[PDB]
Amino acid sequence: VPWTMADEPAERLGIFPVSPSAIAGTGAPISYVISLFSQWRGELAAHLLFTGSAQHYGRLVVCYTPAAPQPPSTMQEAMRGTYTVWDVNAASTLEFTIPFISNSYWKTVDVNNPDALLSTTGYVSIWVQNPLVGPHTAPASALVQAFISAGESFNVRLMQNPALTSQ
Amino acid sequence: NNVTTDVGANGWAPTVSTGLGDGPVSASADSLPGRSGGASSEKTHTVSGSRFSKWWEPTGSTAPSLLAYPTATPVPLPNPDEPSQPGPSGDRTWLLDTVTWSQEFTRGWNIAGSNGMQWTGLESLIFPVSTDTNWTSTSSPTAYPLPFSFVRAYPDSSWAAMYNTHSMWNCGWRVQVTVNGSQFHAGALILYMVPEATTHAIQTARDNAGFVFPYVILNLYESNTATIEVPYISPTPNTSSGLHAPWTFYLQVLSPLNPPPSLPTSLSCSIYVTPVDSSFHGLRYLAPQ
Amino acid sequence: NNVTTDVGANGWAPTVSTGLGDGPVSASADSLPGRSGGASSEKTHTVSGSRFSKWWEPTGSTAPSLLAYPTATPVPLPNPDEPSQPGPSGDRTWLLDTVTWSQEFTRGWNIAGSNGMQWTGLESLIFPVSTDTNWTSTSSPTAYPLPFSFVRAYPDSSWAAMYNTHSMWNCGWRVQVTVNGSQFHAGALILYMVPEATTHAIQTARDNAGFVFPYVILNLYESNTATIEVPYISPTPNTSSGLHAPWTFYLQVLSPLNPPPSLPTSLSCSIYVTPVDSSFHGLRYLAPQ
């Protein structure tokens, strides 16, 4: 996810649903383990690594909203869920926990029906809280590398044909 | 005996599941830690009591007025968040609707008013359920789907406030109806609570076997009111908001109203609704029904 | 000595109030039974421990981040009803407003955005406060009256839900503001919490003696954020909904923004609001602000 000094407040930088349409096709190692099986549960650990300069300052709010018919459209609407305002100039990486605020005990890994009640837990999105600032002759942009891996309570069961026939 | 089949019995360790012989496989109870919910009335939710190494690390009605089923035992919840409770502002007896009961209505005639919905199971429900075409029909309404009818009747209540703000809910329901007739009036109404109302279920509730469902009769011979309460039900420990109606109320006629001559040919009825022990999980933005 | 006057001292039984001599009369503390409220943070409201016969019967900021005043002791309430609490859905940190801070602003310039209100004490407030003419003015807004600005910003929150349904409320307030500037930026903002904001009180908050009020300074030399919290205040133990603003937030400029050359001439600010320990009494119909 890129982030420039021209980006104003309440600007969306990224958003993805927590459903087998996204979490199973990120390219991360966890996405391969999820696609092997039919059901999953537990927390997901997100790590946003700030690969900018040591002179840059600003804030990016990371929001997790549970399941709903429509995703959040604005920043303040997304901030009504579980969020964390992350100041980039502290430690390099942000440790954002995606809680398993789920309807049932297990979520199905079906790519054909990702928006089902028993499939998706919600959306996770990145918005610009405070604009990126820094001294003159500093880089006008800063990349943020978003990692995803399994939490300490993450589980999977019921094996399925891998590869998938998707689309 | 022990019938000639094999229900389980089960096995383990290599008894009923070895490389020499097999019986039918059975699933075991999942022992989970978490917050105690699911079963209404007995909520009292509290904390409970990775386990693998990594490669990189070193008779009946209208007798009394009791719950149609007894309250069940709580279960550990999958979600870790603490619930939001409306309390006395939410869990209270609300005036759901006021409807008329005329003598023209025959056996098995479902009665519902302005806040009610026409639901015989055959109506094509346009999503979301808050669409006006669902509630306004060419014929008279018949059912009171919970919580859909309750939230529509009072959209500004604290219960509906959390209902439109949380993805899942959990509560019981109590319905009461008051019908005042003089000692010269005769007739009987049945207060049905139908679980997962569908085409076949609603039509069998009109018929003779409908008394398998939770019921109380409002007989004008002795009663002026009848109360019925049901605990929470669902395939999941918490019901999805705006997308699932576990209970539906049906006020149908057993014995047609038989009023005395020279008096009005109809009596007024007042339907009440009471959510019992409400909890809401998963707070996020406002998404109404 | 004991000055030459007489503060009390008091009297009783026939000492300082007899038919031979008098001193100034004094009022005693009223010892009342009831539910313990008034003082936020320390709510813990519980039961407490006719008495006449009838004729017919036989250094300072921006150092740390602590409460501007210490929390006071609870008092017995006059009303007997049990309060309704929004809990974590209500008591939480909300994004109140996002506003710009340009270098053109001078000493004592009150900054407020779309959710803010123009309130210098001279504006003619048309009742009720929810009237659009109060919030939309020819000039820029200046204040954030609590809870008026908070309820307007989020009219669908559980806090505002009970606020429009109960006649009286009781909670503290915590305001935080984040302003990110590079190490090359300079300037200072003051986060004021003004009690009972009126014409003279708001203008003295702009001046040199304003630091008598609760304050924290957001100096760009060291800080990117500054937090300030205040407990509940009022002439009554519970504040009337829609008709009284105990606290008002003011983000004014001490030292004008002094940005480095060839950079933007303004920085963005994000104002947060947090109701602390909320209770609502006297449930009735919906009456918004």
XYZ file of C-alpha atoms in Angstrom:
745
model
C 0.000 0.000 0.000
C 1.545 3.320 -1.106
C 1.245 6.549 0.882
C 2.214 10.029 -0.331
C 2.344 13.514 1.194
C -0.456 14.581 -1.194
C -2.945 12.181 0.462
C -5.531 14.105 2.506
C -7.330 12.955 5.683
C -10.114 10.354 5.276
C -8.411 8.891 2.177
C -8.765 5.121 1.745
C -5.468 3.390 0.936
C -6.704 -0.211 0.955
C -9.558 -2.508 1.916
C -10.150 -6.254 1.792
C -12.920 -8.544 3.052
C -12.023 -11.272 5.555
C -13.495 -13.988 3.320
C -12.106 -16.937 1.304
C -12.178 -14.690 -1.799
C -9.326 -12.592 -0.326
C -7.707 -14.394 2.642
C -7.242 -17.517 0.464
C -5.608 -15.677 -2.476
C -3.139 -13.190 -0.975
C -0.041 -15.217 -1.914
C 1.028 -15.437 1.740
C 1.841 -18.836 3.316
C -1.336 -18.665 5.456
C -3.507 -18.326 2.317
C -2.217 -21.690 1.060
C -3.063 -23.458 4.339
C -6.571 -21.931 4.297
C -7.231 -23.087 0.707
C -6.268 -26.684 1.603
C -9.125 -26.905 4.128
C -12.852 -26.106 4.252
C -13.235 -24.420 7.664
C -11.206 -21.937 9.714
C -11.367 -20.062 13.016
C -9.305 -17.989 15.451
C -7.451 -14.680 15.310
C -5.427 -13.361 12.370
C -2.230 -11.376 12.990
C -1.629 -8.425 10.648
C 1.751 -6.666 10.490
C 2.077 -3.298 8.725
C 5.781 -2.605 8.180
C 6.576 1.072 7.592
C 9.412 1.148 5.038
C 9.520 4.957 4.801
C 12.186 7.365 6.048
C 13.173 8.123 9.648
C 12.198 11.778 9.042
C 8.592 11.029 8.011
C 5.663 11.540 10.389
C 1.933 10.833 10.225
C -0.850 8.431 11.166
C -2.742 5.633 9.430
C -5.867 4.254 11.111
C -6.402 0.511 10.611
C -10.049 -0.478 11.048
C -11.689 -3.887 11.393
C -15.477 -3.897 10.980
C -17.504 -7.104 11.527
C -19.857 -8.618 8.927
C -22.439 -6.366 7.263
C -24.367 -6.195 3.948
C -22.331 -3.146 2.826
C -18.659 -2.283 3.474
C -17.660 1.008 5.161
C -17.628 3.964 2.740
C -15.910 6.700 4.788
C -13.151 6.789 7.421
C -15.410 7.737 10.348
C -17.879 4.984 9.386
C -14.999 2.478 9.410
C -13.743 3.857 12.758
C -17.008 2.694 14.392
C -15.504 -0.818 14.591
C -12.354 -2.227 16.185
C -9.538 0.095 15.100
C -6.069 1.305 16.072
C -4.585 4.704 15.198
C -0.994 3.854 14.287
C 1.778 6.452 14.500
C 4.350 5.339 11.917
C 7.346 6.918 13.685
C 7.749 4.579 16.662
C 8.571 0.914 16.006
C 8.879 -0.164 12.363
C 5.956 -2.611 12.348
C 2.376 -2.307 13.627
C 0.927 -5.350 15.413
C -2.766 -5.262 14.476
C -4.853 -8.186 15.747
C -7.906 -9.129 13.669
C -10.348 -10.498 16.270
C -12.573 -13.487 15.483
C -15.865 -11.659 16.062
C -17.830 -14.412 14.349
C -21.417 -15.669 14.224
C -20.567 -19.388 14.362
C -17.617 -21.424 15.678
C -16.231 -22.102 12.183
C -16.098 -20.166 8.905
C -16.387 -21.966 5.561
C -13.673 -21.640 2.894
C -15.896 -21.519 -0.189
C -14.676 -19.170 -2.933
C -18.037 -19.435 -4.764
C -19.958 -17.976 -1.790
C -17.607 -15.582 0.065
C -20.265 -13.143 1.358
C -22.188 -15.856 3.259
C -23.184 -15.563 6.930
C -20.970 -18.572 7.741
C -18.011 -17.432 5.594
C -16.975 -13.791 6.082
C -16.276 -12.013 9.380
C -16.116 -8.480 7.919
C -13.727 -5.957 6.356
C -10.271 -4.604 7.206
C -9.302 -1.215 5.753
C -6.521 1.387 5.897
C -7.369 5.111 6.012
C -5.184 8.221 6.250
C -5.696 9.723 9.722
C -2.982 12.411 9.754
C -1.347 13.320 6.414
C 2.230 12.191 5.759
C 4.638 14.997 6.652
C 8.401 15.438 6.664
C 11.137 18.002 6.036
C 11.888 19.370 2.574
C 14.132 17.222 0.325
C 12.671 14.117 2.011
C 10.873 11.478 -0.088
C 7.351 12.583 -1.077
C 6.091 8.986 -0.751
C 6.464 6.061 1.658
C 5.501 2.419 1.093
C 3.767 0.343 3.775
C 4.253 -3.424 3.467
C 1.212 -5.332 4.765
C 1.964 -8.820 6.109
C -0.543 -11.444 7.243
C -0.030 -14.582 9.339
C -1.888 -16.824 11.791
C -2.696 -15.832 15.373
C -2.125 -18.103 18.372
C -5.731 -19.415 18.261
C -5.920 -19.935 14.474
C -7.132 -23.381 13.369
C -8.254 -25.177 10.209
C -10.036 -28.476 9.523
C -11.756 -30.672 6.914
C -9.334 -31.041 4.008
C -10.431 -30.214 0.464
C -8.948 -30.490 -3.020
C -6.166 -27.845 -3.200
C -5.339 -25.722 -6.304
C -9.064 -24.978 -6.568
C -10.873 -24.765 -9.902
C -11.260 -21.004 -9.479
C -12.212 -18.748 -10.940
C -31.323 -55.114 23.304
C -30.156 -52.652 22.463
C -31.887 -52.803 19.069
C -30.269 -54.768 16.216
C -28.581 -51.604 14.844
C -25.680 -49.651 16.442
C -26.270 -46.070 17.601
C -22.969 -45.677 19.460
C -21.606 -47.390 21.586
C -18.750 -45.489 19.860
C -15.175 -46.831 20.266
C -11.573 -45.813 20.977
C -8.742 -46.433 21.303
C -8.423 -49.130 18.611
C -11.764 -50.828 19.407
C -14.541 -49.701 17.022
C -12.052 -48.212 14.515
C -9.004 -50.399 13.747
C -7.283 -51.797 10.639
C -9.096 -55.133 11.158
C -12.769 -54.108 11.541
C -15.042 -51.063 11.473
C -18.292 -49.770 12.900
C -19.984 -46.432 12.101
C -17.909 -43.337 12.928
C -19.254 -40.871 15.507
C -18.490 -37.233 16.347
C -17.488 -36.171 19.866
C -18.484 -33.105 21.883
C -16.178 -30.132 21.289
C -14.878 -28.869 24.647
C -14.277 -25.145 24.114
C -13.180 -22.269 26.367
C -15.041 -18.972 26.204
C -17.734 -16.647 27.456
C -20.960 -18.357 28.596
C -23.872 -17.334 26.341
C -26.424 -18.787 23.926
C -28.999 -19.766 26.545
C -31.096 -16.738 27.551
C -32.218 -16.083 31.161
C -29.033 -17.843 32.370
C -26.445 -15.592 30.697
C -23.825 -14.856 33.417
C -20.978 -14.673 30.891
C -17.406 -14.825 32.231
C -13.879 -15.962 31.337
C -13.229 -19.717 31.092
C -10.484 -22.093 32.250
C -0.831 -22.554 21.036
C -0.581 -26.229 22.053
C 1.970 -27.246 19.390
C 5.680 -26.543 18.866
C 7.046 -24.564 15.901
C 9.999 -25.526 13.666
C 11.848 -22.204 14.117
C 11.375 -22.080 17.916
C 13.550 -24.011 20.421
C -52.503 -30.697 29.563
C -52.966 -27.848 29.019
C -53.658 -24.170 28.267
C -55.266 -21.893 29.214
C -54.295 -23.227 32.646
C -51.282 -21.307 33.930
C -48.799 -18.885 32.359
C -45.305 -20.379 32.187
C -42.536 -20.673 29.595
C -43.402 -22.926 26.646
C -40.020 -24.628 27.062
C -37.749 -24.717 30.115
C -34.593 -22.592 29.832
C -31.509 -24.508 28.665
C -27.879 -24.427 29.839
C -25.293 -21.835 28.693
C -22.458 -22.621 26.269
C -19.006 -21.109 25.630
C -19.117 -18.475 22.861
C -16.701 -18.377 19.881
C -16.283 -14.564 19.949
C -14.184 -12.868 22.679
C -15.919 -9.443 22.812
C -18.025 -8.391 25.814
C -21.727 -7.864 25.015
C -23.768 -4.660 25.215
C -27.030 -4.909 27.171
C -29.992 -2.518 26.822
C -31.225 -3.440 30.318
C -34.647 -2.235 31.542
C -35.005 0.274 28.670
C -34.890 -2.675 26.233
C -36.163 -5.673 28.202
C -39.689 -4.444 28.883
C -43.293 -5.037 27.787
C -44.044 -2.989 24.647
C -47.402 -2.386 22.987
C -46.705 -4.271 19.753
C -50.042 -3.701 18.004
C -53.784 -3.125 18.439
C -56.020 -5.292 16.230
C -59.737 -6.049 15.816
C -61.314 -9.501 16.220
C -64.625 -9.786 14.342
C -67.067 -12.716 14.319
C -66.686 -13.144 10.538
C -63.277 -14.775 11.134
C -63.435 -18.573 11.026
C -61.296 -21.434 12.370
C -57.558 -20.886 11.818
C -57.771 -17.229 10.777
C -54.505 -15.428 11.561
C -55.137 -11.925 12.937
C -52.655 -9.043 12.641
C -52.791 -5.235 12.516
C -50.814 -2.312 11.086
C -47.484 -3.403 12.618
C -48.017 -7.018 11.476
C -46.893 -8.665 8.236
C -48.665 -10.874 5.702
C -46.680 -14.110 5.972
C -48.209 -17.429 4.906
C -44.821 -18.635 3.589
C -45.767 -17.997 -0.054
C -45.056 -14.237 -0.088
C -41.945 -13.206 -2.033
C -39.865 -11.270 0.509
C -37.829 -8.535 -1.187
C -34.488 -8.029 0.573
C -34.020 -6.228 2.923
C -37.109 -7.033 5.030
C -37.571 -3.293 5.780
C -38.903 -2.792 2.218
C -42.469 -1.421 2.389
C -43.812 -3.972 -0.125
C -43.280 -6.735 2.472
C -45.512 -5.076 5.095
C -48.140 -3.516 2.807
C -50.187 -6.127 0.931
C -53.501 -6.328 -0.940
C -54.896 -8.605 1.806
C -54.781 -8.397 5.616
C -51.503 -9.187 7.444
C -51.206 -12.446 9.416
C -47.928 -12.796 11.369
C -45.585 -10.916 13.697
C -42.027 -11.981 12.829
C -39.595 -11.363 15.686
C -37.619 -9.199 15.923
C -38.580 -7.755 12.496
C -42.041 -6.602 13.616
C -40.756 -5.384 17.003
C -37.929 -3.301 15.493
C -40.286 -1.810 12.881
C -42.872 -0.920 15.553
C -40.265 0.864 17.702
C -37.256 1.861 15.541
C -36.029 4.327 18.210
C -35.911 1.903 21.170
C -32.590 1.056 22.844
C -33.119 -2.572 21.786
C -33.460 -1.588 18.111
C -30.552 0.864 18.499
C -28.114 -1.950 19.345
C -29.920 -4.252 16.884
C -29.011 -1.929 13.985
C -25.451 -1.512 15.351
C -24.477 -5.132 16.176
C -24.153 -8.048 13.748
C -25.618 -10.579 16.194
C -28.122 -10.714 19.057
C -29.543 -13.138 21.628
C -32.771 -12.941 23.642
C -35.997 -14.739 24.523
C -39.506 -13.492 23.763
C -42.723 -13.088 25.743
C -46.026 -12.283 24.047
C -49.250 -11.349 25.835
C -52.685 -10.416 24.481
C -55.594 -8.790 26.341
C -59.143 -9.253 25.019
C -61.932 -7.956 27.268
C -65.364 -9.460 26.701
C -68.394 -9.337 28.978
C -69.679 -12.497 30.689
C -72.091 -12.826 27.741
C -69.311 -13.172 25.141
C -67.927 -16.476 23.860
C -64.958 -17.462 21.691
C -61.354 -18.647 21.861
C -58.066 -17.392 20.390
C -54.735 -19.245 20.283
C -51.399 -17.483 20.858
C -48.871 -19.416 18.745
C -45.092 -19.029 18.772
C -43.886 -20.625 15.528
C -40.150 -21.427 15.185
C -38.640 -20.825 11.716
C -41.947 -20.010 10.018
C -42.105 -21.440 6.487
C -44.899 -22.371 4.050
C -45.599 -25.833 5.496
C -45.017 -24.860 9.150
C -47.493 -21.959 9.111
C -50.267 -24.000 7.444
C -49.867 -26.874 9.929
C -50.146 -24.297 12.743
C -53.640 -23.488 11.411
C -54.572 -27.197 11.499
C -55.288 -29.733 14.286
C -51.680 -30.784 15.006
C -50.561 -27.159 15.555
C -50.696 -27.612 19.347
C -47.269 -29.296 19.158
C -45.908 -25.737 18.894
C -45.868 -23.460 21.974
C -49.425 -22.313 22.642
C -51.871 -20.729 25.065
C -55.616 -20.304 24.470
C -57.471 -17.059 25.243
C -60.933 -18.421 26.035
C -63.571 -15.727 26.666
C -65.425 -18.133 28.981
C -62.860 -17.528 31.761
C -59.920 -15.363 30.607
C -59.465 -11.777 29.438
C -55.722 -12.208 28.811
C -53.185 -14.942 28.042
C -49.387 -14.856 28.258
C -46.752 -17.047 26.599
C -42.955 -16.913 26.774
C -40.269 -18.781 24.834
C -36.499 -18.972 25.332
C -33.956 -18.289 22.586
C -33.488 -20.670 19.623
C -31.211 -20.717 16.533
C -28.691 -22.873 14.605
C -25.950 -20.546 15.971
C -25.358 -19.300 19.547
C -26.071 -15.740 18.312
C -28.598 -14.724 15.632
C -27.599 -12.498 12.692
C -29.294 -9.077 12.802
C -31.767 -8.261 10.019
C -31.419 -11.687 8.356
C -33.102 -14.237 10.651
C -36.438 -14.530 12.480
C -36.217 -17.345 15.061
C -39.736 -16.821 16.476
C -42.978 -15.602 14.886
C -46.239 -14.822 16.705
C -49.631 -16.014 15.424
C -52.953 -15.009 16.984
C -55.484 -17.294 15.292
C -59.100 -18.210 15.992
C -60.060 -21.596 17.450
C -63.738 -20.853 18.079
C -65.175 -17.916 16.078
C -66.230 -14.892 18.146
C -69.809 -15.458 19.305
C -71.028 -12.105 20.641
C -74.384 -11.546 22.377
C -77.167 -10.037 20.208
C -77.547 -6.223 20.047
C -73.833 -5.771 20.886
C -70.835 -4.992 18.642
C -69.844 -7.797 16.252
C -66.135 -7.376 17.091
C -63.832 -6.969 20.105
C -60.550 -5.045 20.297
C -57.270 -6.817 21.096
C -53.943 -5.435 22.357
C -50.798 -7.427 21.555
C -47.697 -6.983 23.730
C -44.101 -8.084 23.142
C -41.290 -8.554 25.680
C -37.648 -9.329 24.850
C -36.178 -11.398 27.696
C -32.494 -11.052 28.631
C -30.885 -9.280 25.654
C -27.200 -9.254 24.650
C -25.533 -7.870 21.514
C -22.119 -8.806 20.083
C -19.875 -7.354 17.367
C -20.171 -3.563 17.420
C -19.730 -1.709 14.119
C -21.435 0.907 11.871
C -25.209 1.349 11.532
C -26.845 -1.245 9.247
C -30.658 -1.317 9.662
C -32.952 -4.246 8.797
C -8.182 34.760 65.516
C -10.351 33.645 64.040
C -10.921 36.887 62.116
C -13.113 39.622 63.642
C -16.209 38.350 61.761
C -18.135 35.086 62.417
C -18.213 32.403 59.714
C -19.778 29.679 61.867
C -19.035 28.563 64.608
C -22.796 27.877 64.242
C -24.820 27.137 67.421
C -27.470 24.839 68.910
C -29.216 24.003 71.091
C -30.095 27.452 72.489
C -26.563 28.893 72.135
C -26.192 30.999 68.957
C -29.984 31.259 68.453
C -31.999 32.057 71.611
C -34.599 34.638 72.685
C -31.838 36.699 74.360
C -29.187 37.047 71.614
C -28.515 36.152 67.982
C -25.679 35.416 65.597
C -25.957 34.723 61.844
C -28.074 31.685 60.920
C -26.409 28.789 59.080
C -27.708 25.870 57.003
C -26.818 22.266 57.858
C -25.933 19.348 55.585
C -28.990 17.385 54.442
C -28.482 13.693 55.263
C -30.465 11.827 52.600
C -30.963 8.145 51.732
C -30.739 7.047 48.112
C -28.763 5.685 45.202
C -25.118 6.833 45.029
C -24.539 8.942 41.895
C -23.504 12.434 40.801
C -19.752 11.832 40.903
C -18.598 10.070 37.719
C -15.919 7.323 37.707
C -17.055 6.332 41.232
C -20.700 5.500 40.464
C -21.376 2.153 42.238
C -25.017 3.037 42.927
C -26.901 0.923 45.487
C -29.695 1.075 48.077
C -29.086 3.139 51.232
C -29.717 2.674 54.961
C -43.211 8.295 57.297
C -41.611 9.485 60.557
C -44.711 11.240 61.949
C -48.039 10.024 63.356
C -51.405 10.731 61.699
C -54.585 11.997 63.412
C -56.819 9.192 62.070
C -54.347 6.384 62.890
C -53.929 4.833 66.377
C 3.298 23.372 36.836
C 2.399 22.352 34.232
C 1.282 21.105 30.802
C 2.281 19.645 28.448
C 3.936 17.452 31.086
C 1.758 14.410 31.732
C -1.805 13.439 30.806
C -4.047 13.251 33.874
C -7.510 14.477 34.862
C -7.787 18.265 35.169
C -9.541 17.781 38.515
C -9.493 14.755 40.823
C -12.735 12.745 40.906
C -15.092 13.686 43.753
C -17.191 11.549 46.117
C -20.648 10.126 45.252
C -23.903 11.476 46.705
C -27.368 9.982 47.313
C -29.724 10.662 44.379
C -33.270 12.082 44.747
C -34.805 9.768 42.100
C -35.398 6.050 42.848
C -35.144 4.613 39.295
C -32.199 2.434 38.233
C -30.032 3.970 35.481
C -29.435 2.705 31.944
C -25.783 2.429 30.891
C -24.534 2.340 27.279
C -21.316 0.595 28.372
C -18.437 0.119 25.892
C -20.623 1.029 22.882
C -21.122 4.491 24.436
C -18.055 5.081 26.612
C -15.413 5.040 23.886
C -13.121 7.394 21.952
C -15.011 8.894 18.986
C -13.618 10.931 16.104
C -15.358 14.216 16.928
C -14.021 16.332 14.055
C -11.141 16.913 11.629
C -9.994 20.542 11.323
C -7.174 22.505 9.661
C -4.617 24.640 11.523
C -3.091 27.322 9.276
C -0.295 29.777 10.117
C -2.587 32.772 9.481
C -4.282 32.102 12.844
C -2.973 34.352 15.616
C -2.880 34.216 19.429
C -6.194 33.099 20.961
C -7.830 31.926 17.728
C -10.444 29.247 18.454
C -10.341 26.455 15.854
C -13.332 24.258 14.973
C -14.556 22.276 11.954
C -17.823 21.086 10.404
C -19.106 19.427 13.602
C -18.160 22.487 15.698
C -20.303 25.504 16.582
C -19.676 29.250 16.472
C -19.954 30.192 20.148
C -18.310 33.359 21.478
C -21.216 33.916 23.909
C -22.781 36.650 21.752
C -24.576 34.347 19.278
C -28.367 34.229 19.653
C -29.132 30.527 20.149
C -32.533 29.625 18.691
C -34.221 26.900 20.750
C -33.835 23.950 20.376
C -30.043 23.812 19.892
C -30.502 21.309 17.013
C -31.684 24.184 14.765
C -29.348 24.466 11.750
C -28.921 28.246 12.150
C -26.937 27.630 15.366
C -24.312 25.444 13.652
C -24.142 27.185 10.259
C -22.800 30.744 10.503
C -21.296 33.375 8.193
C -17.935 33.010 9.992
C -15.927 29.953 11.086
C -17.102 27.919 14.118
C -15.133 28.134 17.384
C -16.382 25.759 20.120
C -17.449 22.164 20.741
C -20.274 22.246 23.302
C -20.692 18.922 25.101
C -22.762 16.884 24.647
C -24.457 19.009 21.934
C -21.592 18.654 19.440
C -21.041 14.970 20.296
C -24.717 14.029 19.843
C -24.913 15.966 16.554
C -21.739 14.286 15.241
C -23.074 10.794 16.030
C -26.900 10.894 16.305
C -27.124 7.081 15.953
C -24.734 6.137 18.790
C -26.010 4.237 21.841
C -25.015 7.239 23.977
C -27.168 9.605 21.889
C -29.950 6.984 21.791
C -30.382 7.103 25.583
C -29.657 10.857 25.545
C -32.754 11.472 23.387
C -34.802 9.025 25.516
C -33.874 10.092 29.084
C -34.536 13.460 30.734
C -31.207 13.489 32.594
C -27.648 12.207 32.168
C -24.318 12.067 34.010
C -20.805 11.486 32.656
C -17.278 12.881 32.470
C -15.473 13.922 29.291
C -12.056 13.249 27.774
C -10.792 15.183 24.758
C -7.653 14.362 22.773
C -6.138 16.008 19.691
C -3.424 14.643 17.380
C -1.343 17.079 15.307
C 1.609 15.563 13.436
C 4.373 17.965 12.459
C 7.911 17.160 11.355
C 10.894 18.039 13.567
C 11.148 21.265 11.531
C 7.689 22.523 12.562
C 7.008 24.883 15.467
C 3.862 26.107 17.227
C 1.631 25.449 20.228
C -2.099 24.787 20.680
C -4.061 24.801 23.949
C -6.833 22.282 24.679
C -9.302 24.136 26.928
C -12.265 22.653 28.787
C -14.490 25.617 29.677
C -17.239 25.094 32.301
C -20.545 26.904 31.619
C -19.282 28.835 28.591
C -20.696 32.374 28.492
C -19.664 35.673 26.857
C -17.173 36.730 29.548
C -15.860 33.210 30.275
C -14.971 32.441 26.648
C -13.150 35.763 26.110
C -11.094 35.338 29.301
C -10.137 31.850 28.056
C -8.523 33.566 25.041
C -6.547 35.873 27.366
C -3.588 35.398 29.762
C -5.556 34.245 32.834
C -7.284 31.438 30.877
C -4.881 28.844 32.328
C -7.018 28.796 35.497
C -9.368 26.567 33.474
C -8.402 22.937 32.721
C -5.716 22.962 30.036
C -3.019 21.039 28.196
C -0.672 22.491 25.561
C 0.097 20.706 22.276
C 3.607 22.003 21.596
C 5.067 20.891 18.242
C 8.573 21.078 19.746
C 8.016 17.776 21.606
C 4.429 16.480 21.264
C 2.240 15.223 18.425
C -0.798 14.707 20.683
C -2.247 15.979 23.966
C -5.017 14.515 26.124
C -7.225 16.130 28.772
C -10.034 14.671 30.879
C -12.546 16.304 33.224
C -15.044 14.788 35.663
C -18.747 15.662 35.730
C -19.996 19.092 36.888
C -23.452 20.722 37.253
C -25.736 22.562 39.726
C -27.796 19.321 39.933
C -26.625 15.706 40.433
C -27.962 14.899 36.931
C -27.911 17.209 33.887
C -31.067 17.880 31.842
C -30.854 16.450 28.306
C -30.837 18.932 25.414
C -30.913 21.992 27.705
C -27.500 22.219 29.408
C -23.849 22.089 28.309
C -21.622 21.617 31.383
C -18.337 21.407 29.428
C -17.196 23.009 26.164
C -13.960 22.263 24.285
C -11.735 25.023 22.869
C -8.675 24.369 20.705
C -6.972 27.766 20.483
C -3.545 28.936 19.346
C -0.876 30.027 21.837
C 2.011 30.346 19.379
C 0.990 30.709 15.702
C 1.963 27.797 13.442
C 5.508 28.409 12.204
C 6.079 25.924 9.372
C 9.412 25.397 7.583
C 9.783 27.127 4.178
C 8.721 25.250 1.005
C 6.246 23.134 3.030
C 2.453 23.421 3.438
C 1.275 26.479 5.394
C -1.186 24.383 7.439
C -1.348 21.099 9.375
C -4.349 18.798 9.831
C -5.786 18.095 13.291
C -8.036 15.266 14.519
C -10.207 15.950 17.572
C -11.459 13.022 19.672
C -14.143 12.898 22.368
C -14.668 10.298 25.112
C -17.631 10.162 27.512
C -16.442 8.660 30.809
C -18.805 6.540 32.928
C -22.294 7.291 31.563
C -25.652 6.827 33.321
C -29.145 7.897 32.235
C -32.225 8.383 34.440
C -35.938 8.904 33.761
C -36.935 6.849 30.720
C -39.752 8.187 28.528
C -40.604 9.005 24.867
C -38.095 10.262 22.282
C -37.302 13.989 22.619
C -34.166 14.969 20.639
C -31.961 18.017 21.301
